[PDB]
Amino acid sequence: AEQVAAERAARKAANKEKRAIILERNAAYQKEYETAERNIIQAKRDAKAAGSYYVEAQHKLVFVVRIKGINKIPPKPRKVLQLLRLTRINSGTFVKVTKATLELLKLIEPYVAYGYPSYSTIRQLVYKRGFGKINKQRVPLSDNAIIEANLGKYGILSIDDLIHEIITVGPHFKQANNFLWPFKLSNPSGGWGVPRKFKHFIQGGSFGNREEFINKLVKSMN
Amino acid sequence: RVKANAAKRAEAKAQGVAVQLKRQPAQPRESRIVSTEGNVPQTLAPVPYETFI
Amino acid sequence: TAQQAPKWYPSEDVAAPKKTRKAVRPQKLRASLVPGTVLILLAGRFRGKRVVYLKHLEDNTLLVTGPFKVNGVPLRRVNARYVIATSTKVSVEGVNVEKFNVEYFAKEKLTKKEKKEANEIKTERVEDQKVVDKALIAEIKKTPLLKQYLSASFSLKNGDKPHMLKF
Amino acid sequence: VLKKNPLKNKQVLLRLNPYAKVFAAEKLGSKKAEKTGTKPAAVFTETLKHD
Amino acid sequence: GIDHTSKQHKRSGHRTAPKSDNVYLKLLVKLYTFLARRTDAPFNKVVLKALFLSKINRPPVSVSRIARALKQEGAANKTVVVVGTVTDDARIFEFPKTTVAALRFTAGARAKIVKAGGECITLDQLAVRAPKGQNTLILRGPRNSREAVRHFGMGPHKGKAPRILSTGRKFERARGRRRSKGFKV
Amino acid sequence: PSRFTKTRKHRGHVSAGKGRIGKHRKHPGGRGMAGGQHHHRINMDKYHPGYFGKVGMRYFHKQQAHFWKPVLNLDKLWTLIPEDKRDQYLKSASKETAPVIDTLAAGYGKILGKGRIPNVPVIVKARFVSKLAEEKIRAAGGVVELIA
RNA sequence: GAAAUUGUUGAAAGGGAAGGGCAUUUGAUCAGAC
RNA sequence: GGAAUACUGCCAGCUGGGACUGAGGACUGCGACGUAAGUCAAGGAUGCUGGCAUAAUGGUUAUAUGCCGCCCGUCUUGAAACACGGACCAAGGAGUCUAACGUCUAUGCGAGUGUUUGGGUGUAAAACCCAUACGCGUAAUGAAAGUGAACGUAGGUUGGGGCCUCGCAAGAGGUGCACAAUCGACCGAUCCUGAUGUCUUCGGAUGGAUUUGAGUAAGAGCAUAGCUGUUGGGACCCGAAAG
RNA sequence: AAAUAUGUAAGAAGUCCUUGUUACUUAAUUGAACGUGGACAUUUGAAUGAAGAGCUUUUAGUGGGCCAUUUUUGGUAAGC
């Protein structure tokens, strides 16, 4: 039983094939991410050239950051904040946009800032601040096998695959998002952009729906 | 709902299509094309003040 | 007994350190440092003097000369972050410089017993200066006032700002 | 024992993404799109320029 | 700060490392904490937890329940193991031959099974015979038979055994306990 | 022992575990059993129903020897028989040899039919017996012999 | 042979209190290590 | 008609300057570059060099400077308070013991339990041994006179840890202690019913009931010790006007 | 006749099929309740979260409260 090159050559072969499989799906998502990103661009030209208006699909995903501290919050908003796992200032969570989630977002509007996040924002978050809930323990991802052993049931094998299930809300988004620990962000690097935070974004403040300006805000936090 | 829920599974097992017996909430809308044939936009402006009394 | 005992004793053996993963790579000098450049020293005996940069020594230091005939600065080595690289260039080609290295500058470390209370030059370091300077002073004569420029001391005047000056 | 970060430390990036090597070598971040010459309808321009 | 959804620094509320200073019980626990760690068998998890338990959570199993246990379908050959104490029941005049594993047997019980052809064993001898608890069954004595539980929860209209030193007539069997004398309970 | 009580841990702390507002006082609610039909009613009613009033009839000059009648149940009936002297009777259901169990010599005034004697015949000498007790002994084959 | 309180010598500071905390300059003193 | 620039966004685009940190201590893991060897910025700092080797760094203390700092304890919604006690210091100074008890715990023996009222004995107020008794538990329910705890594998249904069989596994079937819910059976009481019969007024068979018990349904108890709580006690300490 | 609040449900203890019991009920094996046997298992029956869940014993202190936005009563008002 030499057992220093027999199984080691076996484990390396099993590692190479996993790296091999991870490679096509990253390439596969690339043409899938490119094609769709160019379809809406091109479908807008066709509408204008045909004398019509292309009404894009309503956004399916929002990123929510808790803006207020933990003091002096009425019962109903405090419960809804807990159900989204935002239990301290500058915390992040992805929420699937649905009727049962919109009404939660209205109750918490004075306390959160949210919008529609792009690929660059979400890709950077998981790479820098992505943690998995591993047996009720907050574990840095830092390897594909960590996601593999915990989200391999649903076909998720990598950190890049996990981002895919987030941005395109798939059949296993609920488990995938739940696996992702709530993001602990810092304060924005360049500031909040306003003198007073706790007014609505429409009213010169910070809280509410900032439809794409969340990307600028989260990147300064990230 | 049980009757339809029991009925849909019974018909589905003849072909196995994963009938998805669960209920879904109201989803965000998907894309569409709105055309302006005879529906050309008309511009509205804020109205001035009047007392009406 | 005044203090009874500890029930257990830490092991006296030392642990080997883990495998360090910090390799040594060559230093990258800034672009303003080209051999033959005139340097403005910032610290030491010869702070404020102007000297000629000859060679990059292997221990990250710059081989430098006054020349000794011009301003009295011999063949030394200095650190790149204690000099200012000027735009003035003196052609260093034609100077035999490959013999100088770290082993050339050996201090013959002194023991603790030899404590000097109140109070020479090594034999052939007076001819190496002459050999190099002879090929270097000839190149100095080409540019007018250059020999005068090297013989002066740099200083900041009233109202000059290093963040705006050029050298 | 220590969290090293992707988006830097290129070695860590290749560990988590085998596609990073070909993403960079192909310059997919600065890719160019083929030009198209379609133009908006006359009704669109008048509406945009309407009072 | 954090908005805690649960109380912080809450201990498990379960008992580990039983608080008795008996040296021999500690050795039994040590043998079974190793066993539960390294055998991946749910039987050694139970025994290790049961070795922790207190006296009122170890009611005395009698030889009659053991006899009834062995009269279950296909259980007359299983090894009986009691984490606790085994007492004698002079209310049965027959007995099977099955061996018993326990902490303490009474002399009457030790006499009983030995007379009936059995052999009473300790818990370690069980380990070297049933490391995964093969062919065993756990018997737990009646916890709610103690005289203190009768008194637990008493109030109006539940009949729950008042604490009383001397009983009989003219001891809290009066107004409050009948409709003839005031209200009843 | 004194070194373990919480009095050692209440040194340095003003109220000594009695409160600052409550201000532990001598007998704030009355001494002994005060307030039974008054401010302590809810406690007495919930825990001591029957504490006030009377229920029956009196009995002067009671001595608890006329009602002395310790009970032996029919479950055992056999701890009185000696241990090594038992098994030869249980295995031999022999007539005209059956044991006599004098419950009084044991100290029992009554026998009641708790249950399930072995079917060997035995003679029992009892001051009193229960109804179902007497035939269960007799249905086994024995007989009960009243004694005084 | 303690403390409160007191005398003498020595040192230091002091424009309507004094005492305290963080940080360091200065003065006095000092352990470790070699 | 052809470009540019702005603005917004993206690059797993390149690159310069500054600051803080170096936890870990043989290898293992994941990777990257290489035909291979091997190398690396890859599961946490190393290499070269200088001065000093001493109060130089550092500790202590006193002072100075910048900023800050209201008097403690107590009652209280609220104290720095123009609310109360405290001029200063030493020594003493306030939740204890007992009889009876509740929960929890630990120990022994266990249908029992408890030597220590007393007796024997003794190295003598100890240690050791012992019968008859005695209290508590094993039987309760009725004011009482009284009666007195199995239709049945000591019941059925449901949930159940553990165990057993099949199964690679997932899972399936069997047995199912403690415990939970529930319905039935048994004992006592109240209201019925009233059998064979007999001192013709006794006795109480059997079948019942929106009645009821601090019950049975293969015993858990007894002892000693401990924290905490209770009652009586001077009852944490100090405190009347009185009789 | 709102808004904000408030009760119930969103399954396996469910649904469907056949038939055994009875001293109740019906003209009527008609029903009512409880069961026997069979079929439907991981999208098993909306969302999100779950930090473990359910349970018991015992015992402390407290039982003078006060303030702010909104609602509101007495009062001219009030640090009422």
Swiss-Prot record, chain B:
What are the protein's UniProt keywords? Cytoplasm, Isopeptide bond, Ribonucleoprotein, Ribosomal protein, Ubl conjugation
Could you give one GO CC term from the UniProt record? cytosolic large ribosomal subunit
Q: Which GO biological-process labels does this protein carry?
A: cytoplasmic translation
Top-level taxon: Eukaryota
Q: Does the keyword Ubl conjugation apply?
A: yes
Share any extra remarks.
There are 2 genes for eL21 in yeast.
Protein name, as recorded: Large ribosomal subunit protein eL21A
| Record organism | Saccharomyces cerevisiae (strain ATCC 204508 / S288c) (Baker's yeast)
Gene this chain is encoded by: RPL21A
Q: Which residues of the full protein are shown?
A: 108 to 160 of 160
From Swiss-Prot, chain C:
Gene that this sequence comes from: RPL6B
This one is known as: Large ribosomal subunit protein eL6B
Q: What is the lineage of its organism?
A: Eukaryota, Fungi, Dikarya, Ascomycota, Saccharomycotina
- On this chain, the residues bearing Phosphoserine are S11
The record's principal subcellular location, in a coarse class, is cytoplasm
Query: Quaternary state and partners of this protein?
Result: Component of the large ribosomal subunit (LSU). Mature yeast ribosomes consist of a small (40S) and a large (60S) subunit. The 40S small subunit contains 1 molecule of ribosomal RNA (18S rRNA) and 33 different proteins (encoded by 57 genes). The large 60S subunit contains 3 rRNA molecules (25S, 5.8S and 5S rRNA) and 46 different proteins (encoded by 81 genes).
**Is Cytoplasm among the key words of this record?**
yes
A GO molecular function held by the record = RNA binding
Q: What else is known?
A: Present with 38400 molecules/cell in log phase SD medium.
Which biological process annotations from GO are given for this protein? cytoplasmic translation; ribosomal large subunit assembly
Keywords, in A-Z order: Cytoplasm, Isopeptide bond, Phosphoprotein, Ribonucleoprotein, Ribosomal protein, Ubl conjugation
Cellular localization per UniProt: Cytoplasm
UniProtKB/Swiss-Prot annotation, chain E:
Single GO biological process annotation from the record: cytoplasmic translation
| One GO location term (cellular component) | cytosol
Q: Which residues carry this modification: N6,N6,N6-trimethyllysine?
A: K49
Q: Which Pfam families match?
A: Ribosomal_L18
Recorded hits in Gene3D superfamilies, A to Z, give: 3.100.10.10
As for subcellular location, the record says: Cytoplasm
Q: Which UniProt keywords apply?
A: Cytoplasm, Isopeptide bond, Methylation, Ribonucleoprotein, Ribosomal protein, Ubl conjugation
Return one GO MF term.
structural constituent of ribosome
| Entries under InterPro entries matching the protein | Ribosomal_eL18, Ribosomal_eL18/eL18-A/B/_CS, Ribosomal_uL15/eL18, Ribosomal_uL15/eL18_sf
Positions of crosslink type Glycyl lysine isopeptide (Lys-Gly) (interchain with G-Cter in ubiquitin): K115
- Biological role stated in the UniProt entry: Component of the ribosome, a large ribonucleoprotein complex responsible for the synthesis of proteins in the cell. The small ribosomal subunit (SSU) binds messenger RNAs (mRNAs) and translates the encoded message by selecting cognate aminoacyl-transfer RNA (tRNA) molecules. The large subunit (LSU) contains the ribosomal catalytic site termed the peptidyl transferase center (PTC), which catalyzes the formation of peptide bonds, thereby polymerizing the amino acids delivered by tRNAs into a polypeptide chain.
**Additional record remark:** There are 2 genes for eL18 in yeast.
- Which family would the database say this protein is a member of? Belongs to the eukaryotic ribosomal protein eL18 family.
Q: What protein am I looking at?
A: Large ribosomal subunit protein eL18A
Which source organism does the UniProt entry give? Saccharomyces cerevisiae (strain ATCC 204508 / S288c)
Curated annotation (Swiss-Prot), chain F:
- What is the annotated localization of this protein? Cytoplasm
Name of the gene this protein is made from = RPL28
Concerning Pfam families, the annotation shows:
Ribosomal_L27A
| Record's function text | Component of the ribosome, a large ribonucleoprotein complex responsible for the synthesis of proteins in the cell. The small ribosomal subunit (SSU) binds messenger RNAs (mRNAs) and translates the encoded message by selecting cognate aminoacyl-transfer RNA (tRNA) molecules. The large subunit (LSU) contains the ribosomal catalytic site termed the peptidyl transferase center (PTC), which catalyzes the formation of peptide bonds, thereby polymerizing the amino acids delivered by tRNAs into a polypeptide chain.
Annotated region (Disordered) at 1-38
State the organism of origin. Answer: Saccharomyces cerevisiae (strain ATCC 204508 / S288c) (Baker's yeast)
Q: Which family does it belong to?
A: Belongs to the universal ribosomal protein uL15 family.
Q: Where is this cross-link: Glycyl lysine isopeptide (Lys-Gly) (interchain with G-Cter in ubiquitin)?
A: K95
This protein's superkingdom? Eukaryota
Q: Which Gene Ontology cellular-component terms appear in the entry? A: cytoplasm; cytosol; cytosolic large ribosomal subunit; nucleus
Q: Which InterPro entries match?
A: Ribosomal_uL15, Ribosomal_uL15/eL18, Ribosomal_uL15/eL18_sf, Ribosomal_uL15_CS
* Protein name per Swiss-Prot or TrEMBL: Large ribosomal subunit protein uL15
Share what the entry says about its subunit structure, partners included: Component of the large ribosomal subunit (LSU). Mature yeast ribosomes consist of a small (40S) and a large (60S) subunit. The 40S small subunit contains 1 molecule of ribosomal RNA (18S rRNA) and 33 different proteins (encoded by 57 genes). The large 60S subunit contains 3 rRNA molecules (25S, 5.8S and 5S rRNA) and 46 different proteins (encoded by 81 genes).
